[PDB]
Amino acid sequence: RPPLIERYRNLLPVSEKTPVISLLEGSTPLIPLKGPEEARKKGIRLYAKYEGLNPTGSFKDRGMTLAVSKAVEGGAQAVACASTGNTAASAAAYAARAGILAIVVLPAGYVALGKVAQSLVHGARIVQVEGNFDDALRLTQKLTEAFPVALVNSVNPHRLEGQKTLAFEVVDELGDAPHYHALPVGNAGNITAHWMGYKAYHALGKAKRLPRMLGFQAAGAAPLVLGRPVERPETLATAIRIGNPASWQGAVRAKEESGGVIEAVTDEEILFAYRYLAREEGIFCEPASAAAMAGVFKLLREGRLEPESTVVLTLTGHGLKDPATAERVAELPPPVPARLEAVAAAAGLL
Amino acid sequence: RPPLIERYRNLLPVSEKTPVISLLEGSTPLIPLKGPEEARKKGIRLYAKYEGLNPTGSFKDRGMTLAVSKAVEGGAQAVACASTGNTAASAAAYAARAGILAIVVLPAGYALGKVAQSLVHGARIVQVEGNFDDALRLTQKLTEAFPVALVNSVNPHRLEGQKTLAFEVVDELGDAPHYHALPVGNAGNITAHWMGYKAYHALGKAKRLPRMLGFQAAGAAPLVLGRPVERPETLATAIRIGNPASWQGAVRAKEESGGVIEAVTDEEILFAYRYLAREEGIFCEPASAAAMAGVFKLLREGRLEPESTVVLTLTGHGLKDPATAERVAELPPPVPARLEAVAAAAGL
């Protein structure tokens, strides 16, 4: 578990002067999946790159380590972002590591304490402003122009470069790029970065082939599938509940250049893949992450994945990031007498 | 990349017959801490073995992979435990990967958050109309009568699997640290840590044995008081134990290593919890922070030799305890929507 920036120093926009702000992110597990059965029948092998095991529980740590390191190199006294979710938590953790501030401007009364609790524990400066979400993104931009504050949003070039390393790790472990690489698509910075990584490694010669990128969006927030902005995005998969992806062009180019696709999966399909991963593979990831698996299930049922191929899935966040979705009223059986046979019966051992 | 059981195959009770049930646990980050100042002031270097980055969010995955693999080797149809939280979640995840049942036995008591993670993996919760002892006793008899493996803190394979943490620390540092601090609940972890250092010592990998520094919450410090605590109290749930199952193993580790087992207050725990998050960028479970609180204690008492290396095992991820995170978090009141007060509110 080396610092990501050091592991791929020669391939990243860093110099000897770059302060390495690392929490030893990256180098996450690439878990060979048992199935599904639909895949093994065709000799198709799936591997899950478990990004939920990064320092803050999100793949964004890959980009944040580089973005914060570069921000500090440029004399930044703080970093800022528009998100109230994983980006903010990652920014806050790396800011804490760097000894600088993490600023998040949000419309007053919008977020819940629980959603930003992680970032706050890291000491994030959450600034609720008496204005529209419009004013938030705006005041943030201006803050970056009037003060030594770096914007660490999805389009930050350093976040994209840092995120590209996931592809590097996959190739290092498998020996070549996979035939397919499935991942969730929200603001699309991740799919853009994945493709950047695969192309760079291909140019370097470490990867002989280029994978077909398979991006998946929740049906309720599928602008890249519909080919138009979605004004009212909705989905249980919060991490990809985006109607106007910031990296729209990057995603389309990744899709076209790789010979891949960007399609939609329903919330029911996402939930099914979510349960499948947890109950059959023992992998607990958040709903958005499960969208990638739902996408593979979709293409498998449609017979669109060639037999004997290798499919890698990027599970972007840990299941513990969204306990709400896992805390549906369980409706557990009534308790039983404190007797062994009663327990065994209830346990389903009889 | 080889699974934990494969990486240390020659040092574990496994053979070619053992089915490897792994989620690629282990190989967790050993983060070099920036400080604190008290340590830097004496050239003391701290490293945090971030076990919260294991598959289920806690170090227990280390023991669970071996315990479940061995259980299946023996044809176990399920694994069981009489606890909620981390052990339950880990057992459930590995049972799910192995394709067997995960049974969780609990008293008649009604919070879903305590077992939601085990449930998402498909664990079967069995509530009994009795107390903790009844559940524990019934769980033991269950594993003695039925083809179910007991995966509690004293399962021998859980201890052997957990010992690998020491192996990894030595592998990365190049030698064992002068000191190794960690939280102590049921004491299986400190017992396993010492076992690991002993095994690596036999191999010649560790050129010194660390002094083991175990820490308990003041409201639940039976190993500190020298006797059981009938009503253990502390916000650090993972170590709120009044009668540690591995009592003797903990005492031996303390004595043999020339270490200690002392208490830290809940206030000191929260202080260390906040420190790690705000100063080091590390978000761990409060119980895990007890290890840092322990180091802070010895540091202010001047009990750590200068120029020494100290490793801390941060047992669980901060995401395990959103309740405490929300309690510690503070959302500032809104301010007008103009650069002026935003810059001030941002601390610029």
Automatic annotation (TrEMBL), chain A:
<feature type="domain" description="Rhodanese">
    <location>
        <begin position="81"/>
        <end position="122"/>
    </location>
</feature>
<dbReference type="GO" id="GO:0009088">
    <property type="term" value="P:threonine biosynthetic process"/>
</dbReference>
<feature type="binding site">
    <location>
        <position position="316"/>
    </location>
    <ligand>
        <name>pyridoxal 5'-phosphate</name>
    </ligand>
</feature>
<dbReference type="InterPro" id="IPR026260">
    <property type="entry name" value="Thr_Synthase_bac/arc"/>
</dbReference>
<dbReference type="GO" id="GO:0003941">
    <property type="term" value="F:L-serine ammonia-lyase activity"/>
</dbReference>
<dbReference type="InterPro" id="IPR001926">
    <property type="entry name" value="TrpB-like_PALP"/>
</dbReference>
<keyword id="KW-0456">Lyase</keyword>
<comment type="pathway">
    <text>Amino-acid biosynthesis; L-threonine biosynthesis; L-threonine from L-aspartate: step 5/5.</text>
</comment>
<dbReference type="InterPro" id="IPR000634">
    <property type="entry name" value="Ser/Thr_deHydtase_PyrdxlP-BS"/>
</dbReference>
<dbReference type="InterPro" id="IPR050147">
    <property type="entry name" value="Ser/Thr_Dehydratase"/>
</dbReference>
<keyword id="KW-0663">Pyridoxal phosphate</keyword>
<comment type="similarity">
    <text>Belongs to the threonine synthase family.</text>
</comment>
<protein>
    <recommendedName>
        <fullName>Threonine synthase</fullName>
        <ecNumber>4.2.3.1</ecNumber>
    </recommendedName>
</protein>
<dbReference type="InterPro" id="IPR001763">
    <property type="entry name" value="Rhodanese-like_dom"/>
</dbReference>
<feature type="modified residue" description="N6-(pyridoxal phosphate)lysine">
    <location>
        <position position="60"/>
    </location>
</feature>
<dbReference type="GO" id="GO:0006567">
    <property type="term" value="P:L-threonine catabolic process"/>
</dbReference>
<feature type="cross-link" description="Isoglutamyl lysine isopeptide (Lys-Gln) (interchain with Q-Cter in protein Pup)">
    <location>
        <position position="142"/>
    </location>
</feature>
<dbReference type="InterPro" id="IPR004450">
    <property type="entry name" value="Thr_synthase-like"/>
</dbReference>
<dbReference type="Pfam" id="PF00291">
    <property type="entry name" value="PALP"/>
</dbReference>
<keyword id="KW-0791">Threonine biosynthesis</keyword>
<comment type="function">
    <text>Catalyzes the gamma-elimination of phosphate from L-phosphohomoserine and the beta-addition of water to produce L-threonine.</text>
</comment>
<dbReference type="GO" id="GO:0004795">
    <property type="term" value="F:threonine synthase activity"/>
</dbReference>
<dbReference type="GO" id="GO:0009097">
    <property type="term" value="P:isoleucine biosynthetic process"/>
</dbReference>
<feature type="binding site">
    <location>
        <position position="86"/>
    </location>
    <ligand>
        <name>pyridoxal 5'-phosphate</name>
    </ligand>
</feature>
<dbReference type="GO" id="GO:0004794">
    <property type="term" value="F:threonine deaminase activity"/>
</dbReference>
<dbReference type="GO" id="GO:0006565">
    <property type="term" value="P:L-serine catabolic process"/>
</dbReference>
<feature type="binding site">
    <location>
        <begin position="186"/>
        <end position="190"/>
    </location>
    <ligand>
        <name>pyridoxal 5'-phosphate</name>
    </ligand>
</feature>
<dbReference type="InterPro" id="IPR036052">
    <property type="entry name" value="TrpB-like_PALP_sf"/>
</dbReference>
<keyword id="KW-0028">Amino-acid biosynthesis</keyword>
<dbReference type="GO" id="GO:0030170">
    <property type="term" value="F:pyridoxal phosphate binding"/>
</dbReference>
